[PDB]
Design a protein around this ligand. Structure first.
Ligand code: CA
Ligand code: CA
Lengths: 750, 751
């Protein structure tokens, strides 16, 4: 009756519990690295799930499920972080950080739905995405995986990811399981280091880290993944307050828990908080973990531990019931969702996914400075009716030369970013994705420049080499005079130098936090040399995360932030520089002037004696929310409609935008709420709403804005999130800069 | 009886007799500590103040007269910031900052410093110093790092405990003993961004783990008073943190001294932080949390009176605060002798020769030699005529040498004394600071000690900064100055040695003056680059409030000396060290970062990290806690634990053997670290628990006993209990906290 598709879900559970040995129950809780060997994992360890399953291993795995005793269908899971990361011909979208600059949840939902379509066609049921970590220390190596530094915007974009992945539910053939990842606090640890200690109190976690996670818990995220880090001395894997009080108790979450990579084992060898594997296993079960990821010795460990009474098997059964409940709900015992090669050739890298990718890439680029040089030569047009052709030479500019230079100008691996292609986590595509699927900046300019223009190229700098540890280690490359001289010569015979700079994979991700936030290698010397030629320089930053830029970049003619823009990124950069699209992106994260300047996120807590460091301003180099267009927009008449509010009312306001320049714009209006006096220290302001507004040149619009009063909360001492009565200020404008915000007062009372 | 005037009556009975005679306004008055500069008349009579600070000699003698016209004639506590010497008394002995004295690793010497300070302080009629600081330097960006004893909780406790003992003398009743204060309780030093009084993201377990230990120690050893800092912590102003100010300080520790706020803490809660709607509510909240004395919030008077009247606080809680304040005045014997100033006493003890000699010794033992390619001791070492104190003799083979003494801190009087001294700015009455002739700068030291046939030249080679009005007071870093650099270069090119004295200055230091980059500001890096390139050996002497990132030219210079604001005698000590008239003894009490983004760089990091370096930078500090060279080599060997099984009440005993394999005498600082191999909660990978100084003549070997009480091998568990957990430990012993310099031996504890 456990194969009986009419017997309801709950009965086939203790039925299949009754036919499971104990080694197979402990197995059902496992998720093993298939890159080792699907044979041992499905057979000798009776695994309930596999990850990192190469295309040859996936078909193999279904085949071993047939030779087994009860043939329980596996959950096949993969990191599909921004596209189907490790599938040779898949659409690789911008990173999560790049996507956040669109401020566009509807588009991000499209990205997630396009990714799931491609993932399910390869037989994977479950992605470890989205990432809800909040980017509060820029030294952290995994900032590229976040949606930036704001909890409201993170929850907006992560909610859109979860919707797009999971589709119409557990029966949808192109729906997959999403994962709310790194619950919680993993992004802000000592020194910006990877999985160092998170000095994070319960109130601080509640204040800045949990809101996005609570949002997607209640919207139905199928699974949650536990972070690596220890918080207040306790690894999250055994943190009962977070897993029991908060996640199960307060929020009533009913989805499945998975640990991160060998969380259980690291309690022994890396945090040194468990003496041995038998007790790590026991503690993990006690804490309420459902799925245990790549701690293979949890098999023997969880078995020896039930065998000596440390954990009673009535708990090993607590997890296996919630896991198998998920498997029955998906239909996996009657349709295990095998890879479909005909479906793969129809949908993977289809034209409709490349068009989603192109749109996200174009909207994600942020123009940060512009002295008038852009749009180049005044802006180009394509031939009328040809939305895909070369630009035509513009009136008054028949022959221009564009020199495209810098280490990232023609580097498609860096442009795709971490968790994609050859980034390192998968060993079955060490060439990466096919080069012809990625348009680099150099490619974009060669494809789009008019027939009569020239595009030249010069590497101008190297970033790094690798060396053995002067007790594997990054060695920054020297400035190289001949390499710089060749780029300076190209710039001097050019009308425009496009310098593409940033980081690359050895300076990014797990175990690869950075201290300086600076450009490594010869890049600074190259920027200095280019700018000193007097040819106008556009700096294009292709990088995982905000970097301290040298003074030569602030003296450059324009600066564009591209944040790992995916496969179509280089086309988007050229279209922006040439005026073939209007800039739309807005920063989801702030830029420090120096690593010692941190914290530089916009919602810092009221406090301080002083306003500046004695050697340095506290103003960020670029603030959350900014980004130019190719026009001007004036914000005029901010007024609240009705200034009194009760606790479950809505704050309604109006503001008036006028496009006072010559080009259309899609403007991103940002609504911040400031709680003027608080009974506990709080953020000076917090983002609560935003609106995109389309304006033709000369057009005015009066825009309605609203914020629920129930979102104007703070977290009191004791951890209750409450609306506290009194005065508030509504602040509305084109970024988080105080000198760019209009302000209107309002009141909450009882 | 009249009982409170009867010295044969027990103190607690006198306190109750006086308390019962006081009106409510007099009780509230007694909790006021007011700035004497705002008018002594209304403070003492109209408001019945218990305490005054910043009291001029005229105001001291006027305050005693006004006390004589009050009903109860309750003597005043006169308090002052006496931070490293009698900071704001024109001719007083100014010692190194706490950061400087911490490099001595010498509690007995630090006790002498505090006792000599208290002698000078008590002669001016002051009863009470807001010192020592027990803040722990966990973020190098913080502007007040110079006020701390460095980054280690054990050594902070050692040196703070020594300062309390020295200050408070042989019992309150000793005429040269003053009240000590345990300063900035607690967590004030680790705030967001290293900024001053920003938010402290410090949970209860974190406070108990790294911040409370020195305070608990000095509480149980009888520190007279505790003082709050400024920051809010996990949302709550510390001024209203009942958990800390009551449950911990009274409940868990049994402390009976007086808790005073920091400057206008109660007021700030209204007009600055807007955490309290008015002064009646701020007053009530401060009292309910456990504060006994309110510093410079004069509206606390009406506020507290109104809060009692309206039922916001009980009179009984006012009573409890007044009982602790009166207990201190009775224990000082102020009701029988109010300790008036004595000018004959001042003239005999302030800046005496004994006090100058304590100063010289602490200056000498505090200098830290960080690098030395063998250029030092210069010309192989000098001797004084066979007149210890006096000019040096030219050594054999070096009849004529020129030392070029360069750099902006080479003759800067005020920068050498550091913050909280002289004209540092907290006293608007020392505008010129302390008399120039009382400080030997580095330039002075070399002019006074160089042999007759040698020459000392001088060239300021760089400036650090100018000031400018803010866009609307703002530091503008000075440009490298080509002609100024060239004058120093020309002095070094016609010298045998360049001594480049660099670091920071007061506008880059202290309250409201955190730094982000930790680098040398101004033309200093350009000066060092040009000096090293001349080929003349360069000694870099860092006179600075706190560890700074040094340029690569410093790491290529012949030698680096860390001096940390070394006080009035510092220049003499620096000249003596370079010339070999003393042996280097100082050891770092704090770690130096290579970059601000490298932090944390303190030695006791909580283990847990995936990885061991940043992708662009090693996590190895530039200079580690406990390092420092001498002029000889010392070899460590055969660390052995004498019995490895221990119970909860045992002592871990060990031996280690040291050999002075060099040719010069050395006083070596052996450090003992304890690592708890498996913990129930993540913990520091090692912690300092003991040290020992060992004198070794050249060629001498010594086998040295070592011990750590088992009861000191604690962690703070989940639940916040500080406990010894049973299991395995490792003892690590060596000349610094660098792992590659530590012998290790295992031992175990059974519970
Ligand atoms: Ca409010
Ligand atoms: Ca242990």
């Amino acid at each position: 009756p456990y194969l009986d598709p009419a017997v309801p879900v709950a009965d086939r559970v203790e039925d299949l519990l009754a036919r499971m040995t104990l080694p197979e129950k402990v197995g059902q809780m496992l998720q093993l690295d298939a890159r080792d060997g699907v044979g041992p994992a499905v057979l000798e360890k009776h695994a309930g799930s596999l990850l990192h399953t190469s295309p040859e291993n996936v078909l193999a795995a279904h085949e071993l499920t047939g030779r087994t005793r009860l043939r329980i269908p596996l959950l096949l899971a993969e990191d599909c972080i921004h596209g189907h990361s490790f599938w040779v011909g898949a659409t690789i979208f911008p990173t999560q950080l790049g996507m956040a600059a669109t401020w566009d949840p509807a588009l991000v939902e499209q990205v997630a739905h396009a990714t799931a379509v491609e993932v399910a066609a390869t037989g994977v049921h479950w992605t470890f995405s989205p990432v809800l970590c909040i980017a509060r220390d820029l030294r952290w190596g995994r900032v590229d995986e976040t949606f930036g530094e704001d909890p409201f915007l993170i929850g907006e974009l992560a909610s859109a990811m979860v919707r797009g992945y999971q589709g119409d539910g557990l029966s949808d053939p192109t729906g997959i399981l999403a994962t709310a990842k790194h619950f919680a606090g993993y992004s802000e640890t000592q020194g910006g280091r990877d999985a160092s200690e998170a000095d994070i109190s319960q109130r601080k976690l509640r204040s800045w880290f949990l809101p996005p996670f609570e949002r997607v818990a209640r919207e139905g995220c199928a699974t949650f993944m536990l972070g690596y880090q220890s918080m207040d001395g306790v690894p999250v894997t055994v943190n009962g307050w977070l897993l029991d009080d908060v996640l199960r108790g307060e929020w009533g979450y009913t989805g499945t828990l998975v640990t991160d990579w060998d969380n259980v084992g690291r309690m022994v060898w890396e945090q040194h908080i468990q003496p041995d594997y038998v007790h790590a296993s026991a503690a993990a079960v006690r804490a309420g973990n459902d799925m245990v990821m790549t701690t293979p010795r949890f098999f023997e460990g969880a078995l020896e531990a039930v065998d000596r009474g440390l954990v009673e098997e009535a708990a090993i059964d607590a997890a296996v019931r919630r896991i198998l409940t998920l498997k029955f709900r998906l239909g996996l015992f009657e349709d295990p969702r095998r890879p479909d090669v005909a479906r793969q050739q129809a949908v993977i890298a289809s034209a409709e996914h490349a068009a989603v990718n192109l749109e996200v890439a174009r909207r994600s680029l942020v123009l940060l400075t512009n002295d008038g040089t852009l749009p180049f030569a005044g802006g180009l047009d394509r031939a009328a009716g040809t939305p895909d052709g070369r630009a035509l030479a513009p009136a008054g500019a028949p022959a221009r030369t564009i020199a495209v230079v810098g280490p990232n100008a023609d580097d498609d691996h860096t442009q795709l970013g971490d968790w994609a292609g050859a980034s390192g986590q998968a060993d079955w595509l060490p060439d990466g994705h096919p080069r012809e699927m990625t348009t680099t900046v150099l490619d974009g300019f060669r494809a789009l420049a008019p027939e009569g223009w020239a595009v030249t190229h010069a590497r101008g700098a190297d970033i790094l080499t690798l060396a053995p540890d002067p007790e594997q280690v990054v060695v920054p490359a020297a400035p190289d005079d001949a390499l710089i001289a060749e780029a300076v010569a190209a710039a001097r015979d050019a009308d425009l130098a496009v310098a593409v700079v940033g980081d690359r994979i050895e300076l990014v991700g797990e175990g690869r936090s950075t201290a300086t936030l600076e450009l490594v290698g010869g890049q600074v010397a190259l920027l200095d040399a280019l700018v000193a030629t007097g040819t106008p320089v556009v700096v294009v930053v292709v990088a995982s995360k905000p970097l301290v830029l040298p003074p030569s970049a602030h003296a450059a003619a324009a600066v564009v932030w591209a944040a790992n823009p995916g496969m179509r990124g280089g086309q988007a950069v050229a279209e922006l520089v040439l005026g073939l699209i209007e800039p739309e992106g807005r920063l989801p994260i702030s830029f420090a002037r120096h690593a010692g300047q941190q914290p530089t996120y916009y919602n810092v807590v009221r406090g301080q004696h002083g306003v500046r460091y004695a050697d340095l301003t506290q103003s960020p180099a670029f603030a959350f929310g900014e980004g130019l267009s190719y026009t001007t927009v004036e914000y005029a008449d901010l007024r609240v409609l009705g200034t009194e509010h009760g606790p479950d009312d809505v704050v309604r306001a109006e503001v008036t935008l006028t496009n006072t320049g010559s080009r259309p714009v899609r403007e991103t209006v940002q609504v911040y709420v400031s709680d003027t006096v608080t009974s506990v220290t709080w953020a000076e302001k917090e983002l609560k709403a935003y609106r995109k507004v389309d304006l033709a040149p000369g057009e005015s619009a009066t825009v309605g804005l609203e914020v629920p009063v129930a979102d104007c909360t703070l977290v009191d001492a004791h951890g209750r999130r409450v609306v506290e009565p009194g005065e508030f200020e509504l602040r509305v404008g084109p970024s988080s800069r105080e000198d760019a915000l209009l302000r209107a007062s309002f009141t909450v009372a009882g």
